[PDB]
Amino acid sequence: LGKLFFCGFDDFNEEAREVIQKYRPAGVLIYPGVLSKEYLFLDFMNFLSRNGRFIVSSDHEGGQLEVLKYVPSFPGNLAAGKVDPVFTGRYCEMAGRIMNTLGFNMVFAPVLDLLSLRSFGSDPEVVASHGMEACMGYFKGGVIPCIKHFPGHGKTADDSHYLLPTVNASFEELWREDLLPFRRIFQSRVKTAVMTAHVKYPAVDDLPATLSKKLITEVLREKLNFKGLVLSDAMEMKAISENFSVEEAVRFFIEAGGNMILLDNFRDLPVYYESLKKLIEDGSIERGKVERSIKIVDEYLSALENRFNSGLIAEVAERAIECTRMRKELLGREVVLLVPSNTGDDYDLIPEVAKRFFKVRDVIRYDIEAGPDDVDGELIFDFVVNASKNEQVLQAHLSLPSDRTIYFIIRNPFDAKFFPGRSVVITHSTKPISVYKSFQHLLGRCS
Amino acid sequence: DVDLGKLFFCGFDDFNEEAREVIQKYRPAGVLIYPGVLSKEYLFLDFMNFLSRNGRFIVSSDHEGGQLEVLKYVPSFPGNLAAGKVDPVFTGRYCEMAGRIMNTLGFNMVFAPVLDLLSLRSFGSDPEVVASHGMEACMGYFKGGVIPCIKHFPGHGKTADDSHYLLPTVNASFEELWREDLLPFRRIFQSRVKTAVMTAHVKYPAVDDLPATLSKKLITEVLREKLNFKGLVLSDAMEMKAISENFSVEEAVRFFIEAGGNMILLDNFRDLPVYYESLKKLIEDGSIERGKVERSIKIVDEYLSALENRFNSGLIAEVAERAIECTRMRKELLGREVVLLVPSNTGDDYDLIPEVAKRFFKVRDVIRYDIEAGPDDVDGELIFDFVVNASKNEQVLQAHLSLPSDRTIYFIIRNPFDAKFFPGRSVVITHSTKPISVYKSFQHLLGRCS
């Protein structure tokens, strides 16, 4: 049943690994919380490559919403709308190719919402041609597009994160305008997923579209003949969470004909998960719908097997680390960090990475050409660079208390020769993922 | 003979009208893009767009992974030393990933892998380890869509000296170079991966007096004959002190080409005319055999043809270019000093507007205004109002409209509907807050809008 869930990860840690392993969500959305720390990102991809098949997605639309530094920044849908739609296709093929190479297999784009920066324009036809090119391009590049937000989010000024918005359009107006690019895309039979809008359409129905059996079954499934994968926008968003209970959102969305529940926080997965299981057991959710949902998800999952996973990098970092035997009991103490003064950016990043793994009492930035001034603490991490320049530098390093000092030889691994009888870790790299992996090793296999 | 540009590979630390002039005048076959361009994405994209329109080029970077990383698009790698500690397959996978990304951006060569022995950028001391990881690297880059360029022949590892500072020396005998430093090079040459070879600006006294780059013994007797490499051979950058403080330009050119070299690498496109003219002189006074220049041109053309690619990230530049709209502008106002009114901070885009404007206009001041308030009144010889949400209320819109209509240009960079609220005003619409779009709006302003 984890298959009816798509979880956003704003961090990656033992809690995230636990949730994923216990509930087996089928979908993974990676937030800037992870992407902005490249070591976390890479290690997350490696983890996912080892724990089954996932749909792996981002919100990298281009233009206004950009979260992947790996994709060149793009003017956005509004500028694209002004231009020959082939260009939109080329942009999405480029973007998709890059994403796919990293390990992504889905993107939550294009936006088909009409303009009344993230929109292709006012003209429904323009939005149709650019949205089709975008879905095709993304797909050609190696990523499944997800069009959003059905039936059209464009005619409200209000934001679904803040309140439940309202679009007053008649159904005939939605059909003629807001729904037209969605319709052209389904009629052209380009492979896509669909995301729903947390928006109320009062001239049509009471429920937000995410929760509306009329909007999802009668309009999307039957009138629009879309039989593919349907996702909620993130359920925790206030448009839903402040007007319906978790149980109500689960029931309505699934009864409405929805397939995957999008959570913006993986930690919320247990509540929602259990909620789903409960609603199935007391019969408030038709089992046939959950089964049809699971089948659709299994189709996409089988269809998405990527040959590419940038987590290979994490792997290299992991396997290039060497350690002497480490005393387990010292690892719970507070650490003083001795870090080469500012390859320099790598050094600047060491404290942040260390803080994930150990309590830190302070950070001392030493001059590599002098070596560390004398210091003491419960546990000392000396991040050794250029230890052998002369005897005075080397003895600056060797004077530290052998009993509670760990030498991380992060540049020239030959400096390791100069530390007999000492606790020594060799990383063969100054890069954050290598430091990260060296902490893992220290707490893990080295003790 | 209009093809002598094929014998040049030029580094670009900037992209500008001089760069287009040199490229169009000399037609160098090779383009190496430096951080001066790569760190300014609007520049990088506009350069790629320029390259797509001006013929076939070999386009390369120094993105090795590890210590030398210049492409933010490629995820960071621990580097060759860490890689050498691990199953070489992981090296092939990284280079395939990296190559796939590079090829998508529009690159078709990478100046990697380093096959120099360790005595961070090396796979290690053990020649066999270096050989297997180097082969994996070449195969990976190649699978990914980029032609590798192995370096630095015949091996740079056994010197403590740096070619940017002086001419280093490796004392190894040829029997030792053959057994060790050359083993990973030999491994690549015995495969069927297409590769280029870059020479080392290093002297091997037990073997020859000349830096390998300028050594007929090392490039013809060893590389062309003993090793049977018939592919593309490049110098390391000729301007480097190891060469330039010991040889004349004319000597560097003569020796390298007479040595069996094919492409001369310049680390500065602005050096292309001197070297270029030098080449021509040496060809006309017969100091360079025509047959060699011709074989060289043949080799470069074969490589060029091998690159038939569908990907160029310059399309982004193109989109940015075509989405710009402007009212007619008075050419005569454009040489004045500009006062910039920039939203206070998408936020990072606003921050970048001054840098971009400075390439195109003299800038007298930069004022950051509040979008919910609009600009305080100001005056200057030319005012650029970078308009965001002018329609919030009347007080904002009138903050914007108070500016002197005669010498204010309105850049409507978010909501293009604001354009309605500036009748009779000089107005430019970008449809984007992005640097490349702003860059293109300045170009259009100075170009087609006048």
Tab-separated table of C-alpha atoms in Angstrom, chain A residues 26-384:
chain	number	residue	atom	x	y	z
A	26	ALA	CA	6.380	4.046	-4.499
A	27	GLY	CA	7.197	7.704	-5.086
A	28	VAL	CA	9.995	10.013	-3.918
A	29	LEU	CA	10.041	13.770	-4.262
A	30	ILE	CA	13.322	15.445	-3.460
A	31	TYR	CA	13.141	18.862	-1.919
A	32	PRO	CA	15.779	21.599	-1.714
A	33	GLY	CA	16.318	20.428	1.875
A	34	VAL	CA	18.210	17.571	0.288
A	35	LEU	CA	19.247	19.035	-3.069
A	36	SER	CA	21.049	22.017	-1.544
A	37	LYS	CA	23.392	19.615	0.256
A	38	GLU	CA	24.948	17.672	-2.565
A	39	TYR	CA	26.436	14.959	-0.237
A	40	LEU	CA	22.908	14.208	1.134
A	41	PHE	CA	21.444	14.122	-2.299
A	42	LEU	CA	24.038	11.690	-3.662
A	43	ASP	CA	23.813	9.422	-0.664
A	44	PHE	CA	19.967	9.482	-0.906
A	45	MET	CA	20.185	8.369	-4.581
A	46	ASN	CA	22.540	5.543	-3.596
A	47	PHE	CA	20.176	4.447	-0.830
A	48	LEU	CA	17.184	4.459	-3.234
A	49	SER	CA	19.151	2.425	-5.813
A	50	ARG	CA	19.554	-0.229	-3.092
A	51	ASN	CA	15.985	-0.326	-1.705
A	52	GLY	CA	13.806	-1.168	-4.653
A	53	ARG	CA	12.058	0.694	-7.385
A	54	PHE	CA	10.845	4.196	-6.876
A	55	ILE	CA	9.365	6.901	-8.968
A	56	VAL	CA	11.844	9.716	-8.395
A	57	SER	CA	10.735	13.235	-9.024
A	58	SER	CA	11.442	16.935	-8.582
A	59	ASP	CA	9.696	20.302	-8.896
A	60	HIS	CA	12.226	21.570	-11.417
A	61	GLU	CA	9.838	23.351	-13.834
A	62	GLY	CA	12.355	25.776	-15.184
A	63	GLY	CA	12.130	29.517	-14.812
A	64	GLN	CA	10.565	30.468	-11.515
A	65	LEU	CA	10.690	27.132	-9.768
A	66	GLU	CA	14.237	25.725	-10.191
A	67	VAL	CA	15.705	23.297	-7.678
A	68	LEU	CA	18.388	21.355	-9.643
A	69	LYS	CA	21.635	23.205	-10.150
A	70	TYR	CA	22.494	20.493	-12.698
A	71	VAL	CA	19.952	21.858	-15.250
A	72	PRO	CA	20.780	25.193	-16.866
A	73	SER	CA	18.429	27.919	-15.689
A	74	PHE	CA	15.573	28.690	-18.145
A	75	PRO	CA	13.548	31.929	-18.739
A	76	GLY	CA	10.380	29.959	-17.891
A	77	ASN	CA	6.950	29.110	-19.335
A	78	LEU	CA	5.873	32.710	-19.990
A	79	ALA	CA	8.941	33.482	-22.102
A	80	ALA	CA	8.625	30.038	-23.711
A	81	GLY	CA	4.936	30.746	-24.608
A	82	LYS	CA	6.110	33.702	-26.613
A	83	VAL	CA	8.250	31.400	-28.781
A	84	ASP	CA	8.071	28.540	-31.317
A	85	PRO	CA	6.947	25.560	-29.161
A	86	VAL	CA	9.737	23.329	-30.581
A	87	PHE	CA	12.061	25.301	-28.321
A	88	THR	CA	10.001	24.242	-25.325
A	89	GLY	CA	10.377	20.668	-26.480
A	90	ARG	CA	14.160	21.031	-26.813
A	91	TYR	CA	14.405	22.622	-23.406
A	92	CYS	CA	12.445	19.838	-21.799
A	93	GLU	CA	14.440	17.140	-23.628
A	94	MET	CA	17.703	18.696	-22.360
A	95	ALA	CA	16.326	19.060	-18.845
A	96	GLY	CA	14.893	15.564	-18.862
A	97	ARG	CA	18.095	14.011	-20.185
A	98	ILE	CA	20.080	15.581	-17.381
A	99	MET	CA	17.484	14.597	-14.750
A	100	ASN	CA	17.394	11.030	-15.978
A	101	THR	CA	21.201	10.813	-15.928
A	102	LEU	CA	21.129	11.905	-12.257
A	103	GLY	CA	18.558	9.190	-11.351
A	104	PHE	CA	15.213	11.056	-11.673
A	105	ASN	CA	12.477	9.331	-13.643
A	106	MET	CA	9.651	11.869	-13.279
A	107	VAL	CA	9.209	15.661	-13.254
A	108	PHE	CA	6.214	17.556	-11.779
A	109	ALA	CA	5.882	19.757	-14.886
A	110	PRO	CA	4.608	21.247	-17.218
A	111	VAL	CA	2.173	23.690	-15.687
A	112	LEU	CA	-0.874	24.007	-17.935
A	113	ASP	CA	-2.546	26.649	-15.779
A	114	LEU	CA	-3.681	29.608	-17.854
A	115	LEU	CA	-2.401	33.126	-17.270
A	116	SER	CA	-5.172	35.545	-16.000
A	117	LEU	CA	5.698	33.326	-14.800
A	118	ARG	CA	4.982	29.619	-14.385
A	119	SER	CA	2.296	29.687	-17.184
A	120	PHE	CA	2.768	29.414	-20.930
A	121	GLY	CA	0.138	32.197	-21.441
A	122	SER	CA	-3.532	33.291	-21.693
A	123	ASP	CA	-4.261	31.609	-25.001
A	124	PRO	CA	-5.381	28.014	-24.272
A	125	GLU	CA	-4.128	26.900	-27.704
A	126	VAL	CA	-0.595	28.190	-27.077
A	127	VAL	CA	-0.541	26.485	-23.721
A	128	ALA	CA	-1.681	23.333	-25.519
A	129	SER	CA	1.102	23.330	-28.120
A	130	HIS	CA	3.816	24.156	-25.581
A	131	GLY	CA	2.486	21.698	-23.013
A	132	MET	CA	2.475	18.912	-25.625
A	133	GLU	CA	6.015	19.718	-26.780
A	134	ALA	CA	7.081	19.828	-23.094
A	135	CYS	CA	5.557	16.424	-22.243
A	136	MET	CA	7.076	14.870	-25.343
A	137	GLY	CA	10.502	16.473	-24.742
A	138	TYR	CA	10.616	15.475	-21.087
A	139	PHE	CA	9.668	11.977	-22.085
A	140	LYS	CA	12.267	11.762	-24.903
A	141	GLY	CA	14.862	12.942	-22.371
A	142	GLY	CA	14.044	10.020	-20.045
A	143	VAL	CA	11.549	11.494	-17.520
A	144	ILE	CA	7.684	11.057	-17.236
A	145	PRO	CA	5.993	14.469	-17.293
A	146	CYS	CA	3.247	15.237	-14.721
A	147	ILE	CA	0.819	17.896	-16.012
A	148	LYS	CA	-0.706	20.195	-13.364
A	149	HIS	CA	-2.947	21.349	-11.872
A	150	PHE	CA	-6.177	19.755	-13.115
A	151	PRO	CA	-8.610	21.351	-13.981
A	152	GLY	CA	-6.713	24.658	-14.022
A	153	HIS	CA	-5.329	26.801	-11.203
A	154	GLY	CA	-4.874	29.944	-13.253
A	155	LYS	CA	-8.068	31.971	-12.562
A	156	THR	CA	-7.560	32.422	-8.794
A	157	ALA	CA	-5.108	34.836	-7.214
A	158	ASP	CA	-5.046	32.821	-4.019
A	159	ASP	CA	-2.468	30.316	-3.080
A	160	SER	CA	-3.385	26.779	-2.121
A	161	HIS	CA	-0.596	26.813	0.510
A	162	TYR	CA	-2.374	29.630	2.369
A	163	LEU	CA	-6.076	28.906	1.972
A	164	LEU	CA	-8.511	27.048	-0.256
A	165	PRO	CA	-8.701	29.092	-3.454
A	166	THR	CA	-11.830	29.554	-5.533
A	167	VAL	CA	-12.290	29.674	-9.309
A	168	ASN	CA	-15.804	30.858	-10.236
A	169	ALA	CA	-15.703	29.682	-13.858
A	170	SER	CA	-18.672	27.705	-15.208
A	171	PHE	CA	-17.958	24.153	-16.283
A	172	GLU	CA	-18.554	25.165	-19.850
A	173	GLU	CA	-15.858	27.888	-19.441
A	174	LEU	CA	-13.387	25.435	-17.868
A	175	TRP	CA	-14.028	22.992	-20.680
A	176	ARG	CA	-13.464	25.645	-23.336
A	177	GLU	CA	-10.377	27.192	-21.743
A	178	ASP	CA	-8.652	25.844	-18.651
A	179	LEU	CA	-9.214	22.225	-19.609
A	180	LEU	CA	-8.272	22.552	-23.269
A	181	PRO	CA	-4.496	21.967	-22.937
A	182	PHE	CA	-5.159	19.011	-20.621
A	183	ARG	CA	-7.569	17.662	-23.269
A	184	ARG	CA	-5.174	18.137	-26.241
A	185	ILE	CA	-2.492	16.318	-24.339
A	186	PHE	CA	-4.786	13.306	-23.606
A	187	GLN	CA	-6.068	13.285	-27.147
A	188	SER	CA	-2.549	13.270	-28.543
A	189	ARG	CA	-1.818	10.313	-26.282
A	190	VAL	CA	1.549	11.576	-25.044
A	191	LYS	CA	2.585	9.685	-21.881
A	192	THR	CA	1.912	11.725	-18.787
A	193	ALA	CA	0.921	11.686	-15.164
A	194	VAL	CA	-1.645	14.237	-13.899
A	195	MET	CA	-1.581	16.373	-10.745
A	196	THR	CA	-4.801	17.772	-9.207
A	197	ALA	CA	-5.417	21.333	-7.966
A	198	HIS	CA	-6.451	22.074	-4.346
A	199	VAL	CA	-8.970	24.564	-5.725
A	200	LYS	CA	-12.722	24.853	-5.339
A	201	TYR	CA	-14.852	25.351	-8.436
A	202	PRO	CA	-18.197	26.514	-6.809
A	203	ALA	CA	-20.171	26.781	-10.125
A	204	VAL	CA	-19.348	23.088	-10.548
A	205	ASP	CA	-18.919	21.279	-7.222
A	206	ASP	CA	-18.228	21.834	-3.494
A	207	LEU	CA	-15.065	19.906	-3.106
A	208	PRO	CA	-11.564	20.971	-3.975
A	209	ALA	CA	-10.709	19.260	-7.243
A	210	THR	CA	-8.209	16.952	-5.397
A	211	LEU	CA	-11.174	15.651	-3.394
A	212	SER	CA	-13.975	15.907	-6.033
A	213	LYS	CA	-15.430	12.677	-7.472
A	214	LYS	CA	-17.233	14.871	-9.999
A	215	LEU	CA	-14.092	16.644	-11.202
A	216	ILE	CA	-11.860	13.488	-11.180
A	217	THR	CA	-14.236	10.687	-12.232
A	218	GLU	CA	-16.856	12.411	-14.348
A	219	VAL	CA	-14.599	15.030	-15.945
A	220	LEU	CA	-11.047	13.572	-15.915
A	221	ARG	CA	-11.687	9.785	-16.171
A	222	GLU	CA	-14.869	9.654	-18.327
A	223	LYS	CA	-15.323	12.930	-20.264
A	224	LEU	CA	-11.528	13.392	-20.734
A	225	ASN	CA	-10.806	9.655	-21.041
A	226	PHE	CA	-7.618	9.850	-18.948
A	227	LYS	CA	-6.934	6.411	-17.508
A	228	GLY	CA	-3.389	7.145	-16.350
A	229	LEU	CA	-1.702	8.023	-13.071
A	230	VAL	CA	-3.385	10.659	-10.955
A	231	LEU	CA	-1.669	12.424	-8.056
A	232	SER	CA	-2.856	14.850	-5.417
A	233	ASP	CA	-1.040	18.105	-4.833
A	234	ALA	CA	0.602	17.790	-1.357
A	235	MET	CA	-2.147	16.831	1.089
A	236	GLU	CA	-0.728	18.730	4.032
A	237	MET	CA	-1.198	22.072	2.276
A	238	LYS	CA	-3.694	24.221	4.231
A	239	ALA	CA	-6.283	24.312	1.373
A	240	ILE	CA	-6.829	20.698	2.287
A	241	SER	CA	-5.559	20.318	5.852
A	242	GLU	CA	-7.490	23.262	7.316
A	243	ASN	CA	-10.856	22.172	5.841
A	244	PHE	CA	-10.727	18.430	5.913
A	245	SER	CA	-9.279	15.831	8.254
A	246	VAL	CA	-6.482	13.477	7.161
A	247	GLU	CA	-9.056	10.710	7.008
A	248	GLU	CA	-11.443	12.821	4.909
A	249	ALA	CA	-8.677	13.778	2.400
A	250	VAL	CA	-7.602	10.115	2.070
A	251	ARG	CA	-11.160	8.884	1.537
A	252	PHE	CA	-12.294	11.610	-0.849
A	253	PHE	CA	-9.194	11.558	-3.035
A	254	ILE	CA	-9.197	7.774	-3.405
A	255	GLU	CA	-12.999	7.514	-3.864
A	256	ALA	CA	-12.739	10.407	-6.306
A	257	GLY	CA	-10.589	8.195	-8.501
A	258	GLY	CA	-7.132	9.352	-7.387
A	259	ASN	CA	-4.158	6.972	-7.430
A	260	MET	CA	-1.264	8.450	-5.484
A	261	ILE	CA	-1.452	10.623	-2.409
A	262	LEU	CA	1.287	13.271	-2.478
A	263	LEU	CA	2.712	14.151	0.976
A	264	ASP	CA	5.102	17.073	1.295
A	265	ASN	CA	6.672	15.449	4.340
A	266	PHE	CA	7.754	11.805	4.610
A	267	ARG	CA	7.264	11.943	8.370
A	268	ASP	CA	3.514	12.315	7.808
A	269	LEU	CA	3.497	9.009	5.965
A	270	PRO	CA	2.591	6.833	8.987
A	271	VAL	CA	-0.553	8.814	9.948
A	272	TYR	CA	-1.840	8.937	6.382
A	273	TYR	CA	-0.733	5.337	5.764
A	274	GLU	CA	-2.619	4.016	8.754
A	275	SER	CA	-5.541	6.221	7.858
A	276	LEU	CA	-5.696	4.544	4.448
A	277	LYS	CA	-5.429	1.060	5.940
A	278	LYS	CA	-8.196	1.908	8.393
A	279	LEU	CA	-10.524	3.259	5.688
A	280	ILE	CA	-9.984	0.115	3.716
A	281	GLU	CA	-10.694	-2.240	6.616
A	282	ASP	CA	-13.983	-0.667	7.686
A	283	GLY	CA	-15.041	-0.488	4.044
A	284	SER	CA	-15.170	3.324	3.594
A	285	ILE	CA	-12.899	2.807	0.585
A	286	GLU	CA	-13.841	0.436	-2.202
A	287	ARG	CA	-11.072	-2.150	-2.442
A	288	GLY	CA	-11.369	-2.304	-6.228
A	289	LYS	CA	-10.200	1.312	-6.447
A	290	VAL	CA	-7.104	0.710	-4.344
A	291	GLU	CA	-6.349	-2.336	-6.492
A	292	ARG	CA	-6.781	-0.388	-9.738
A	293	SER	CA	-4.546	2.297	-8.284
A	294	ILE	CA	-1.840	-0.220	-7.326
A	295	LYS	CA	-1.961	-1.678	-10.831
A	296	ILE	CA	-1.428	1.706	-12.467
A	297	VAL	CA	1.472	2.467	-10.144
A	298	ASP	CA	3.068	-0.942	-10.877
A	299	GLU	CA	2.822	-0.167	-14.572
A	300	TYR	CA	4.669	3.165	-14.195
A	301	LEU	CA	7.239	1.585	-11.790
A	302	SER	CA	8.082	-1.237	-14.194
A	303	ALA	CA	8.184	1.265	-17.055
A	304	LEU	CA	10.736	3.528	-15.243
A	305	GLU	CA	13.921	1.318	-14.570
A	306	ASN	CA	16.850	3.846	-15.138
A	307	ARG	CA	20.346	2.787	-16.042
A	308	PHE	CA	21.685	5.924	-14.416
A	309	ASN	CA	22.154	6.747	-10.769
A	310	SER	CA	24.419	9.555	-9.576
A	311	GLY	CA	24.538	7.808	-6.187
A	312	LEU	CA	27.444	5.861	-7.731
A	313	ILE	CA	29.413	8.839	-6.503
A	314	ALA	CA	28.345	8.173	-2.917
A	315	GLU	CA	29.457	4.658	-3.501
A	316	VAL	CA	32.951	5.595	-4.609
A	317	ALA	CA	33.250	7.902	-1.615
A	318	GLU	CA	32.202	5.097	0.665
A	319	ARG	CA	34.621	2.489	-0.710
A	320	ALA	CA	37.697	4.772	-0.783
A	321	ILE	CA	37.796	5.196	3.000
A	322	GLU	CA	40.302	3.502	5.249
A	323	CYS	CA	40.425	3.369	8.993
A	324	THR	CA	42.422	1.922	11.832
A	325	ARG	CA	40.371	0.298	14.631
A	326	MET	CA	38.363	2.916	16.563
A	327	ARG	CA	37.295	2.882	20.191
A	328	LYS	CA	33.500	2.888	20.203
A	329	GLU	CA	33.211	4.531	23.636
A	330	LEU	CA	34.823	7.845	22.568
A	331	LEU	CA	32.453	8.456	19.715
A	332	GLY	CA	29.669	9.770	22.018
A	333	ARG	CA	31.836	12.627	23.376
A	334	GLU	CA	31.894	16.246	22.215
A	335	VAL	CA	34.348	16.885	19.398
A	336	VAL	CA	36.734	19.736	18.847
A	337	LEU	CA	37.235	20.202	15.100
A	338	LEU	CA	40.576	21.218	13.645
A	339	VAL	CA	39.989	22.346	10.099
A	340	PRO	CA	42.477	23.721	7.562
A	341	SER	CA	42.043	27.487	7.176
A	342	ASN	CA	40.543	28.796	3.953
A	343	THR	CA	39.356	22.909	-2.070
A	344	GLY	CA	38.956	25.697	0.470
A	345	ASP	CA	35.135	25.472	0.187
A	346	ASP	CA	35.435	21.776	1.041
A	347	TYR	CA	37.136	22.727	4.275
A	348	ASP	CA	34.457	25.371	5.005
A	349	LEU	CA	31.909	22.567	4.675
A	350	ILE	CA	33.504	20.122	7.101
A	351	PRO	CA	31.859	21.542	10.313
A	352	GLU	CA	28.324	21.362	8.917
A	353	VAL	CA	28.885	17.740	7.877
A	354	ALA	CA	30.439	16.813	11.233
A	355	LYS	CA	27.543	18.323	13.169
A	356	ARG	CA	25.182	15.708	11.630
A	357	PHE	CA	27.156	12.905	13.262
A	358	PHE	CA	28.836	14.180	16.434
A	359	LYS	CA	28.339	16.781	19.089
A	360	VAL	CA	30.744	19.644	18.386
A	361	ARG	CA	32.230	21.827	21.107
A	362	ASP	CA	34.075	24.216	18.766
A	363	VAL	CA	35.726	24.789	15.430
A	364	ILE	CA	39.318	25.839	15.229
A	365	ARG	CA	40.679	26.900	11.869
A	366	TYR	CA	44.427	26.170	11.737
A	367	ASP	CA	47.137	27.317	9.354
A	368	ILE	CA	48.389	24.391	7.292
A	369	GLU	CA	51.862	25.979	7.129
A	370	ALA	CA	52.170	25.985	10.904
A	371	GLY	CA	49.921	23.122	11.843
A	372	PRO	CA	47.516	23.150	14.779
A	373	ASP	CA	48.236	25.126	17.904
A	374	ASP	CA	48.079	22.961	20.976
A	375	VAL	CA	44.581	22.129	22.146
A	376	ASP	CA	42.618	19.610	24.197
A	377	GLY	CA	39.027	18.339	24.352
A	378	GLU	CA	37.151	15.117	24.915
A	379	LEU	CA	37.628	14.090	21.320
A	380	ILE	CA	39.633	15.829	18.638
A	381	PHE	CA	39.234	15.530	14.862
A	382	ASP	CA	42.360	16.759	13.146
A	383	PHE	CA	41.648	17.231	9.419
A	384	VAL	CA	45.181	16.866	8.269
